[PDB]
Design an enzyme around this catalytic site. Structure first.
Site, PDB file in Angstrom:
ATOM      1  N   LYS F 158       6.042  -7.578  19.550  1.00 56.95           N
ATOM      2  CA  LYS F 158       6.658  -6.311  19.169  1.00 56.95           C
ATOM      3  C   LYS F 158       5.745  -5.515  18.244  1.00 56.95           C
ATOM      4  CE  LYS F 158      10.588  -7.486  17.479  1.00 56.95           C
ATOM      5  NZ  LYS F 158      10.354  -8.939  17.674  1.00 56.95           N
ATOM      6  N   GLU F 184       9.613  -5.496   7.581  1.00 57.34           N
ATOM      7  CA  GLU F 184       8.412  -5.524   8.407  1.00 57.34           C
ATOM      8  C   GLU F 184       7.497  -6.714   8.107  1.00 57.34           C
ATOM      9  OE1 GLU F 184       6.725  -4.700  10.870  1.00 57.34           O
ATOM     10  OE2 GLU F 184       4.851  -3.625  10.539  1.00 57.34           O
ATOM     11  N   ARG F 185       7.775  -7.466   7.038  1.00 57.67           N
ATOM     12  CA  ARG F 185       7.098  -8.664   6.500  1.00 57.67           C
ATOM     13  C   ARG F 185       5.873  -8.364   5.630  1.00 57.67           C
ATOM     14  NH1 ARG F 185       4.820 -12.510  11.305  1.00 57.67           N
ATOM     15  NH2 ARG F 185       6.334 -11.230  12.446  1.00 57.67           N
TER      16      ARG F 185
HETATM   17  N1  ADP Z   1      -1.170  -7.506  23.614  1.00 57.83           N
HETATM   18  C1  ADP Z   1      -1.376  -8.755  23.137  1.00 57.83           C
HETATM   19  N2  ADP Z   1      -2.518  -9.425  23.398  1.00 57.83           N
HETATM   20  C2  ADP Z   1      -2.728 -10.665  22.926  1.00 57.83           C
HETATM   21  N3  ADP Z   1      -1.843 -11.343  22.177  1.00 57.83           N
HETATM   22  C3  ADP Z   1      -0.652 -10.793  21.841  1.00 57.83           C
HETATM   23  C4  ADP Z   1      -0.353  -9.434  22.317  1.00 57.83           C
HETATM   24  N4  ADP Z   1       0.868  -9.122  21.857  1.00 57.83           N
HETATM   25  C5  ADP Z   1       1.312 -10.184  21.144  1.00 57.83           C
HETATM   26  N5  ADP Z   1       0.410 -11.178  21.128  1.00 57.83           N
HETATM   27  C6  ADP Z   1       0.616 -12.470  20.434  1.00 57.83           C
HETATM   28  O1  ADP Z   1       1.823 -12.358  19.680  1.00 57.83           O
HETATM   29  C7  ADP Z   1       1.607 -12.597  18.289  1.00 57.83           C
HETATM   30  C8  ADP Z   1       2.112 -11.415  17.473  1.00 57.83           C
HETATM   31  O2  ADP Z   1       3.521 -11.285  17.617  1.00 57.83           O
HETATM   32  P1  ADP Z   1       4.307 -10.145  16.803  1.00 57.83           P
HETATM   33  O3  ADP Z   1       4.391  -8.911  17.662  1.00 57.83           O
HETATM   34  O4  ADP Z   1       3.710 -10.052  15.422  1.00 57.83           O
HETATM   35  O5  ADP Z   1       5.781 -10.777  16.676  1.00 57.83           O
HETATM   36  P2  ADP Z   1       7.022  -9.897  16.160  1.00 57.83           P
HETATM   37  O6  ADP Z   1       7.815  -9.631  17.414  1.00 57.83           O
HETATM   38  O7  ADP Z   1       7.715 -10.796  15.168  1.00 57.83           O
HETATM   39  O8  ADP Z   1       6.385  -8.674  15.550  1.00 57.83           O
HETATM   40  C9  ADP Z   1       0.118 -12.790  18.080  1.00 57.83           C
HETATM   41  O9  ADP Z   1      -0.127 -14.076  17.506  1.00 57.83           O
HETATM   42  C10 ADP Z   1      -0.513 -12.712  19.451  1.00 57.83           C
HETATM   43  O10 ADP Z   1      -1.148 -13.956  19.756  1.00 57.83           O
HETATM   44 MG    MG Z   2       7.116  -7.691  13.900  1.00 55.98          MG
END
Ligand code: ADP
Ligand code: MG
Ligand code: ATP
Ligand code: ADP
Ligand code: MG
Ligand code: MG
Lengths: 49, 504, 69, 471, 49, 469, 52
Positions: F158, F184-185
């Site tokens: 996300k 947002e952490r």
């Molecule tokens: N477009 C992308 N390409 C590569 N890895 C991704 C991508 N999107 C998410 N990830 C993986 O997801 C993780 C990040 O998730 P995040 O979006 O921070 O979670 P949340 O939904 O809690 O925000 C990263 O560790 C990454 O490895």
């Molecule tokens: Mg997030």
């Protein structure tokens, strides 16, 4: 047709604002009259209830 | 200024606790159980905010507030106006978007009216009603052929979060252009932009010449969303009882669409929990079935003694993960005289109307159809039932026999026939002509991934080469023996001529 | 009784106060009455006996915004 | 007027009323709230809270009520009229006629809603088959006299049509009267489509409506009205039971009764039970069902429609009624969509009275063999779905043909189904249907194709149709 | 442009805004007296703008 | 003004008694002096009786006793609005937290509790908003001035999609942007979002120079998270009302909902469903209806919505679902399969996915892609146990095309170069439509599936396949 | 037997990739890539030398 409807809406808004702008034409006049024409003891008699 | 000495001794109370749109009104004796309390204007406030005195406890009146409660403070005076909630009704409501209190919100000006009907009333009665006979032509061939809706019928539209429930309701509203029916679209808890888009869609096709919109958006108080469907239902009752002039004829037929009774039940649950009423299943109040039924039993079809008018209800229910066994979905399914099930799996698979004909039910049935549609729909329903039965041997089992393959393929053609684009309703003559073509083996040669196109081009043919055939079919759609030799000819002839001239 | 109140717009002296309390012989003779100056009434009178209010104020006669508004 | 109290609280359809401490109303008493229109609101007491305060279910709108309103106790529970005056009329939970006819006079007997069921020693254990006009009901799940029978199905399967068809059949071809309990009755199913369908002439000048009683606890009524409408209809039918007549009772829906009980219990502040249902579900269901028994004097024999959402028979509404049934008719939507409008599944439709010692040896043999051949066809239709019937069959062709003929022969045109179809109704005696199925079971129908078995009466009608076609 | 004409018409006090307000105040506050014991200076100073 | 006394302290809810004639309003703000010259600005929520009010702390409230004085400010929480709020990082109360100086008194202060725009103000005009992401621009296209949301679980991408959207579109705005980091952490936000917004240059001005940032992060007590979204909306509404276009990114609306739920639990309200507040729908309406674009100005909203566990039937995402013009669903199953733009095409919809708005070919391609994926989803149970061999030839081709489509929706991102060792790829909506039309037409059937993983348009797939040869 | 049972497929590190010694990342990029290739070929490790 929507433009005609919007023109009618603007006419209605102007008609409503005529009364909205008549707030100063009535409230201040009523306050001044109550200060002068009403004066004191203008409480009548609530004998009905 | 019209004051009759103003001697009225209005009963008053004081706000002792105002919370989340709920105010405790302290001593407000001789208040009726659903009055409107006024909250008269005070210092810094030039308007009156009305409330509904729902909870009449001992030495306490708990009233839900129809508006913003931020300006209501503890110690404020309230006056118990003797009036129950009523809304303006009549000719002037047509083409206007109003809030559940009847105040216009489209900015087009004041509502012109002379009658106010209360939003709460008893259903028309027992000897008052009559059998549902006149169809509501939704313009959707699947609904009008397999799950018919008649005037005075409560037909639920139940589905997932994005499957086409509002699309089906809007198409049904659009199809009642020259059908002599007044449509009402109650938006309960919908976002204001969605209601604006719906009103724009209705204005684009000219449906606002006969449509009333009663919207209580999500930002508005739960009290407004609670009385959102009952208002509008009052307008439909006035239309079905007193009538309204429309295109030069006195229309007494109404079609009310509650676009979210799930959101209405959520709003009522919020009201009940803020009033600290005992919860039931899924935290809903005990009288949440009594709520919707009280709303949905007012959609009747009166006999000729009481006017002959009718009010048609189209409740809309949104389920979570297709869970039709939840509390509110089961309540509305039990109340209504028929259900329209929409599936996201069918929606994504090309079935754009997303009608799940297998589980969708219309309890009125053939009585809610024209005789032409009854003649041309029995074979369609039987063939679709056979296809749904023996569609298990259709994904990978390919040998089967001649009969099973023929039944599967006929079912596939009929299902492809039911797919419709949005905002493109079909007239009843077009639908019965297409169904007569399909059910009489006239489509057995044209392949499946052209069927919809075939239908469209056939209708175009009937709209250009042979308009008199459509007029002939529409003129005698009510006779018991519809496929007369006069109508069977020049329709089979038209189908054969179209098949000859057009390569398919 | 305890909730009885008389509210005008102009400030009251003792003479018209006792004149007003004399009028309340209709309810309980000399009722326990509290007065409030409340200059925003723009004339008139508000009589609260128990849980009932007679709103004879000219602001109530003007019904806030005019019927035309 | 034994006592007069005042309303203390109005919470939805729950009224708390304070009465004098020496004249508090009883538990199931009825209390009338006079309104300013010449009418009254009848609430049913449910509890006695503390010193003179009673909690009551409204059985009305309670949108005209204020605190401190006078409340007159009636001293006894809700009294509904009984006797011939109730015959041919339409009532509600309070016993007030809701049709256009005049009010019931004060000379008639009025009986309380709540009555003890017949005792254990009054039970008539002699099982007797009640003759229904339906082929499949007679053969597969026979109707027990003095017993309670249920219909299970989804929406639009035909439960209400079947119920009104039994009303018409047993009032026309038999002298048995009928009492109808529209619990949660839809105002389209009850206010129309049953009144008009009971305007079917019996002999010359009497309709089925004139020989039936109707009590509609409509859906827009508060949950207490829908809760006690079944007991109102039971009270009305118990007069005809006590006269020695074998009375018929049709409860048009059971799960709505359960829903009304659950809503009433949730509104009263009772602790929820199971999945949010009432704690007194079994006791309420028993109180309703145990009054429908066969006694020495008379017998109330009942049919009760039950709607199962999806295929869930484990919901509290069908689960709490299973203990009270003598027979179940399982309606299926698949059979209904196959134009077999009396959509009874011969399989999964059981009956306690289907015993050779009760319905006879021939009836039991015919029903068991019909179920056996239908069970064999349930697999043979799958088998022939891919391997054509002509390809290979060791007597499978004959049994498939016979099973198709009998599953079409279970279909019967109804008197009340003339509106849907136009085919005139048919009534078959219990002897004629078992005789016809015996004749069709072993030969005698192998030459008639599976088109003359669709909508017929006995086997003689199928024959007459066949030799009418071959003219 | 159409609403500008309505605004200009409403800008006149005694023409269509002060007369009606004065008559309404006379009818409501007292027994139909335009001036009574005052309101003479407030007749032209009602709007005060 | 109106000095009262603290009666009770339950969590972040403070019950304070006030004089009878000086009770604070419903959404009024009351300050506890707290000592040391810094106040605790509680916000009233309820009035309970004879001067008794209940307020939410908007702060720690962890070291204050009963009997403390409470000064009623007489007005709700007022936050600064205007060009002075551009390039600054704010609190729930509008106090800047960056190293820059405080906002001057001459800047207009607006209450955070304002009425949403009326029905006449709503703007229904919709057009395509190109984002550069294939699955977003094809299946659930963005609306300019429309509300779109990106639902997802915990480990799905996300924040990565939000970061890629910012990196793609915030360099060309023709307006301003507002970022509400509600829960947002604070690591993936101001530690990273603010750093990357000061590195992107727009005509010698950084993106951050035209961006308001308001951060009610996870460390904050429930009150700050409960009102920080309204603070950011108040700051964005000023630029909307004066005609400027606004790009609004609110991260994890579910954190707003969860803060409201915790406050309602502490406020003594009766819970609904799984421990949620009875006023969930009204709170969601209060926040979401202020996000809508109007006739004066447009707000192009892009919210993120956390899904508890993986339950999309949770009341908070379910209430969010109906407030959107475009919905994107992120699935854990797709993310675990390394298709990291893990958008579910069958569970993602958009309002402007209409042949009149976006185009006939775009609509046809998107609907055919969704139909093929739905056929694959229907045949998943067949493939799981029988295998591919039992399917028909048309079904085999459909499943192969669906697998290639599932792999092809994956796209390397500029902000995701650390995870995948590939450069960021921007694919225009026209190229996305043409590439998926070519994939559905039959081209690429000979190409193995692995060459569709993490590529741009179809030309990149062809180039990779020819390089492998 | 893989006692440090690291699920390389789903175990991630959102930050700390930049907080790595350049030696480790230089020698571990190839390791991660080839482990990804091995996981891709895990489904194809059921053929009697049909892929070589
Ligand atoms: N477009 C992308 N390409 C590569 N890895 C991704 C991508 N999107 C998410 N990830 C993986 O997801 C993780 C990040 O998730 P995040 O979006 O921070 O979670 P949340 O939904 O809690 O925000 C990263 O560790 C990454 O490895
Ligand atoms: Mg997030
Ligand atoms: N027959 C149809 N053909 C094509 N698209 C359709 C059709 N019916 C509905 N849609 C699509 O559905 C969307 C319109 O919303 P829809 O009618 O599905 O709402 P709903 O099911 O009532 O739910 P909600 O309002 O909660 O989103 C648009 O994306 C529109 O393209
Ligand atoms: N005997 C019958 N003949 C023809 N149609 C029938 C028959 N029984 C039921 N139906 C169909 O079922 C509908 C009525 O179903 P109903 O019994 O009211 O549903 P439920 O069983 O849920 O009460 C009618 O519209 C009719 O089309
Ligand atoms: Mg919708
Ligand atoms: Mg029924």
């Amino acid at each position: 047709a929507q433009a005609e409807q919007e023109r009618i809406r603007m006419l209605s808004e102007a008609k409503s604002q005529i009364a909205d702008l008549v707030t100063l034409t009535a409230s201040r006049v009523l306050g001044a009259e109550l200060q002068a024409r009403g004066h004191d003891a203008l409480i009548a008699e609530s004998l009905a209830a | 200024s019209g004051v009759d000495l103003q001697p009225r001794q209005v009963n008053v109370g004081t706000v002792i606790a105002v919370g989340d749109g709920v105010a405790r009104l302290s001593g407000l004796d001789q208040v009726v159980a659903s009055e409107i309390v006024e909250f008269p204007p005070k210092a810094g406030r030039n308007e009156s905010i009305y409330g509904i005195a729902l909870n009449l406890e001992q030495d306490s009146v708990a009233a839900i507030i129809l508006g913003d409660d931020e300006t209501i403070e503890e110690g404020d005076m309230v006056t118990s106006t003797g009036r129950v909630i009523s809304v303006p009704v009549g000719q002037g409501l047509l083409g206007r978007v109003v809030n559940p209190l009847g105040q216009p919100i489209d900015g087009k000006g004041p509502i012109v009216y002379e009658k106010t009907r209360p939003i709460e009333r008893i259903a028309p009665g027992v000897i008052t009603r009559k059998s549902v006979d006149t169809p509501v032509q939704t313009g959707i061939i699947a609904i009008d052929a397999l799950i018919p809706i008649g005037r005075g019928q409560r037909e639920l539209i139940i589905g997932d979060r994005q499957t086409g429930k509002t699309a089906v309701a809007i198409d049904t509203i659009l199809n009642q252009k020259g059908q002599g029916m007044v449509c009402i679209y109650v938006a309960i808890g919908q976002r204001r932009a969605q209601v604006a888009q719906v009103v724009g869609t209705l204005e684009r096709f000219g449906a606002m010449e006969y449509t009333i919109v009663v919207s209580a958006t999500a930002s508005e108080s739960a009290a407004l969303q609670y009385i959102a469907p009952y208002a509008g239902c009052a307008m439909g009752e006035e239309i079905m009882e007193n009538g309204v002039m429309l295109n030069g004829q006195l229309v007494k037929d109404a079609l009310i669409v509650y676009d979210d009774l799930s959101k209405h039940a959520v709003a009522y649950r919020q009201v009940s929990l803020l009033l600290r009423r005992p919860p039931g299943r899924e935290a809903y109040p005990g009288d949440v079935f009594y709520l919707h039924s009280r709303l949905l039993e007012r959609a009747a079809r009166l006999n000729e003694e009481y006017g002959g008018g009718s009010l048609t209800a189209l409740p809309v229910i949104e389920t979570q993960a297709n869970d039709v066994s939840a509390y509110i979905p089961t309540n509305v399914i039990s109340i209504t005289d028929g259900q329209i099930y929409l599936e996201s799996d069918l929606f994504n698979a090309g079935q754009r109307p997303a009608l799940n004909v297998g589980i969708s039910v219309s309890r009125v049935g053939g009585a809610a159809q024209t005789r032409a549609m009854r003649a041309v729909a029995g074979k369609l329903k039987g063939e679709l039932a056979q296809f749904r039965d023996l569609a298990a041997f259709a994904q990978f089992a390919s040998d089967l026999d001649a009969t099973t393959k023929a039944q599967i393929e006929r079912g596939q053609r009929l299902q492809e026939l039911l797919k419709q684009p949005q905002y493109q309703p079909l007239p009843v003559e077009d639908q019965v002509a297409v169904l007569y073509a399909a059910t009489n083996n006239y489509l057995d040669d044209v392949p499946v991934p052209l069927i919809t196109k075939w239908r469209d081009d056939f209708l175009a043919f009937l709209r250009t080469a042979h308009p008199e055939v459509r007029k002939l079919i529409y003129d005698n759609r009510l006779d018991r023996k519809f496929p007369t030799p006069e109508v069977k000819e020049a329709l089979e002839a038209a189908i054969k001529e179209f098949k000859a001239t057009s390569n398919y | 009784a305890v909730d009885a109140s008389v509210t005008s717009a102009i400030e009251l002296s003792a003479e018209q106060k006792e004149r007003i309390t004399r009028e309340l012989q209709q309810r309980y003779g000399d009722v326990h009455v509290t007065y409030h100056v409340d200059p925003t009434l723009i004339g008139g009178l508000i009589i609260r006996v128990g849980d009932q209010v007679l709103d004879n104020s000219l602001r109530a006669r003007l019904s806030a915004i005019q019927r035309v508004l | 007027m034994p006592a007069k109290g005042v309303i203390q609280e109005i919470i939805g359809v729950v009224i708390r009323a304070k009465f004098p401490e020496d004249e508090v109303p009883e538990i199931y008493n009825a209390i009338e709230i006079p309104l300013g229109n010449g009418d009254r609101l009848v609430c049913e007491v449910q509890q006695q809270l503390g010193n003179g305060v009673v909690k009551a279910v409204a059985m009305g709108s309670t949108d005209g009520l204020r605190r401190g309103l006078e409340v007159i106790d009636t001293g006894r529970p809700i009294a509904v009229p009984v006797g011939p005056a109730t015959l041919g009329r339409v009532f509600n939970v309070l016993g007030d006629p809701i049709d256009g006819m005049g009010p019931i006079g004060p000379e008639v007997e009025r009986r309380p809603i709540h009555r003890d069921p017949p005792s254990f020693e009054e039970q008539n254990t002699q099982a007797q088959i009640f003759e229904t006009g339906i082929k499949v009901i007679d053969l597969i799940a026979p109707f027990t006299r003095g017993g309670k029978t249920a219909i299970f199905g989804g929406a639009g399967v035909g439960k209400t049509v079947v119920i009104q068809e039994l009303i018409a059949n047993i009032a026309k071809e038999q002298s048995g009267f009928s009492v109808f309990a529209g619990v949660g009755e839809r105002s389209r199913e009850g206010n129309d489509l049953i009144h008009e369908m009971k305007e079917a002439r019996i002999d010359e000048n009497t309709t089925v409506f004139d020989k039936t009683v109707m009590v509609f606890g409509q859906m827009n009524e508060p949950p207490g009205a829908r809760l006690r409408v079944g007991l109102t209809a039971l009270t009305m039918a118990e007069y005809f039971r006590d006269e020695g007549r074998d009375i018929l009772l049709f409860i048009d829906n059971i799960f709505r009764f359960v829903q009304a009980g659950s809503e009433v219990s949730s509104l009263l502040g009772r602790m929820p039970s199971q999945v949010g249902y009432q704690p007194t579900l079994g006791t309420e269901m028993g109180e309703l069902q145990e009054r429908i028994t066969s006694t020495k004097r008379g017998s109330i024999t009942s049919m009760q429609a039950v709607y199962v959402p999806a295929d869930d028979y484990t919901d509290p509404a069908p689960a709490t009624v299973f203990s009270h049934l003598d027979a179940t008719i399982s309606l299926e939507r698949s059979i209904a969509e196959r134009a077999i409008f009396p959509a009874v599944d011969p399989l999964a439709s059981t009956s306690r009275i289907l015993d050779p010692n009760i319905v006879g040896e021939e009836h039991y043999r015919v029903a068991q063999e019909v179920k056996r051949v239908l069970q064999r066809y349930k697999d043979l239709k799958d088998i022939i779905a891919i391997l054509g019937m002509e390809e290979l069959s060791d007597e499978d062709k004959l049994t498939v043909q016979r099973a198709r003929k009998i599953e079409l022969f279970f279909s019967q045109p109804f008197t009340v189904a003339q509106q849907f179809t136009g085919r005139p109704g048919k009534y078959v005696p219990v002897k004629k249907t078992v005789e016809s199925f015996a004749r069709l079971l072993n030969g005698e129908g192998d030459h008639i194709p599976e088109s003359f078995f669709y909508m017929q009466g006995d086997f003689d009608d199928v024959l007459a149709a066949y030799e009418a076609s071959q003219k």
